[PDB]
Design an enzyme around this catalytic site. Structure first.
Site, mmCIF file in Angstrom:
data_model
loop_
_atom_site.group_PDB
_atom_site.id
_atom_site.type_symbol
_atom_site.label_atom_id
_atom_site.label_comp_id
_atom_site.label_asym_id
_atom_site.label_seq_id
_atom_site.Cartn_x
_atom_site.Cartn_y
_atom_site.Cartn_z
ATOM 1 N N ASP A 254 7.258 5.570 25.584
ATOM 2 C CA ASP A 254 6.382 5.959 24.343
ATOM 3 C C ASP A 254 5.106 5.703 24.509
ATOM 4 O OD1 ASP A 254 5.559 6.552 21.810
ATOM 5 O OD2 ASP A 254 6.555 5.319 20.682
ATOM 6 N N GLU B 24 24.671 4.322 18.065
ATOM 7 C CA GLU B 24 23.950 4.061 16.962
ATOM 8 C C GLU B 24 22.711 4.974 16.690
ATOM 9 O OE1 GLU B 24 21.380 0.789 16.453
ATOM 10 O OE2 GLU B 24 21.177 1.125 14.359
ATOM 11 N N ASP C 179 1.555 6.641 22.937
ATOM 12 C CA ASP C 179 0.717 7.537 22.062
ATOM 13 C C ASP C 179 -0.745 7.410 21.861
ATOM 14 O OD1 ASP C 179 1.991 8.316 19.101
ATOM 15 O OD2 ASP C 179 0.044 7.156 18.637
#
Ligand SMILES: [Zn+2]
EC number: 2.7.7.102
Length: 369
Positions: free
Chosen positions: A109, A44, A111
């Site tokens: 991730d 995907e 941040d």
């Protein structure tokens, strides 16, 4: 870099996807040697398009199809998701319950925005060379654990394009991990917990903790005491005291009166005690169970273009992690102007980041034999 002008994105993205985006390497990555049937065909992708339209379950038959469609779309954003039981682009005609996410890289991730409470140098919206050290420590801490503790061999770290970093762990056995195992790995790596609402976010011999502390110790003085000056004065040392048990703001409060700067207040603070809970709350990566836990989760593609900063989501060379400078990461405008003058994608500032990606791909190929 020069301040990016996002009004030029439509034309710049067209040129970038036509001449610069590294399709050959990108396909070499996601096709994983072509040893598993349909592994790329069942991947995907999601895109953000003209007018901010979001589409997912996009999929492609081969590299040529991906090239042609990306050059048609010229997407602002690209996300990569799981490998499915069926082509994502036929999912609406797959039977209820039969369309299943089967494999995906383990991803992380980190941040800068999750550190608002512990940096003093920027507004939540900016980063500077002072607070970027938080990302350096995050990479070192997480990568050491992934490499040494879990024995994962194929780790691609990538700049988010603005204020964070991502990791794609790509080992064959890792791509098969269940959501439950992924969750277990996140919880093993997590030490800082508590939303905006929580003043003390670290409650503690765990080997991973000792290992992570020893990395932090190498940065702490220059980062915390010299650069962040987390004890420059009252309303900041208070924040620290908010992390120390009920009964000592007194001694400390008054010696911070006596003592002159953060360095001294710290050498002191240590004497009495805690030190580790402080260092971790200020320096340790804050994760996000969400992104890593789900096999179907979508994460920003490497070689994406950031729509606000214009910067490319480049691979980060782990051997030069301490020298990584987000501020010198090329913008799409910068590299398109290079291409205009040189006519060769190899003769732009993108080429060195593609080289880092190629070293990662070479190791994957070697592992497959
Ligand atoms: Zn800063």
């Amino acid at each position: 870099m020069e301040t990016f002008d996002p009004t030029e994105l439509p034309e710049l993205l067209k040129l970038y996807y036509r001449r610069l985006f590294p399709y050959s390497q990108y396909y070499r990555w996601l096709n994983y040697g072509g040893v598993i049937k349909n592994y790329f065909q069942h991947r995907e992708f999601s895109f953000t398009l003209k007018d901010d339209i979001y589409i997912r379950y996009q999929s492609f038959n081969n590299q040529s199809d991906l090239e042609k469609e990306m050059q048609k779309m010229n997407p602002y954003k690209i996300d990569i998701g799981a490998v499915y039981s069926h082509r994502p682009n036929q999912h609406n005609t797959v039977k209820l319950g039969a369309f299943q996410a089967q494999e995906k890289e383990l991803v992380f991730d980190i941040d800068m925005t999750d550190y608002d409470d512990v940096r003093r140098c920027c507004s939540s919206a900016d980063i500077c060379p002072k607070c970027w050290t938080l990302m350096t420590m995050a990479i070192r801490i997480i990568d050491r654990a992934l490499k040494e503790d879990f024995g994962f061999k194929h780790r691609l770290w990538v700049y988010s394009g603005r204020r964070g970093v991502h990791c794609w762990v790509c080992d064959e056995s890792v791509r098969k991990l269940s959501s439950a195992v992924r969750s277990g790995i996140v919880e093993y790596l997590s030490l800082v917990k508590g939303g905006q609402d929580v003043k003390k976010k670290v409650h503690l011999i765990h080997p991973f903790i000792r290992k992570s502390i020893n990395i932090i110790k190498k940065y702490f003085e220059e980062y915390a005491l010299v650069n962040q000056d987390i004890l420059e004065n009252k309303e900041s040392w208070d924040k620290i005291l908010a992390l120390v048990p009920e009964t000592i703001h007194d001694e400390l409060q008054q010696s911070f009166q006596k003592s002159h700067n953060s360095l001294q207040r710290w050498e002191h603070l240590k004497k009495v005690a805690l030190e580790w809970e402080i260092m971790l709350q200020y320096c340790f990566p804050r994760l996000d169970i969400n992104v890593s836990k789900g096999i179907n989760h979508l994460l920003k593609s490497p070689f994406s273009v950031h729509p606000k900063t214009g910067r490319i989501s480049v691979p980060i060379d782990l051997q030069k992690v301490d020298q990584f400078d987000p501020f010198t990461v090329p913008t799409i405008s910068f590299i398109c102007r290079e291409l205009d003058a040189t006519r060769d994608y190899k003769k732009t500032s993108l080429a060195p980041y593609v080289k880092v990606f190629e070293h990662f791909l070479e190791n994957l190929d070697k592992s497959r034999k």
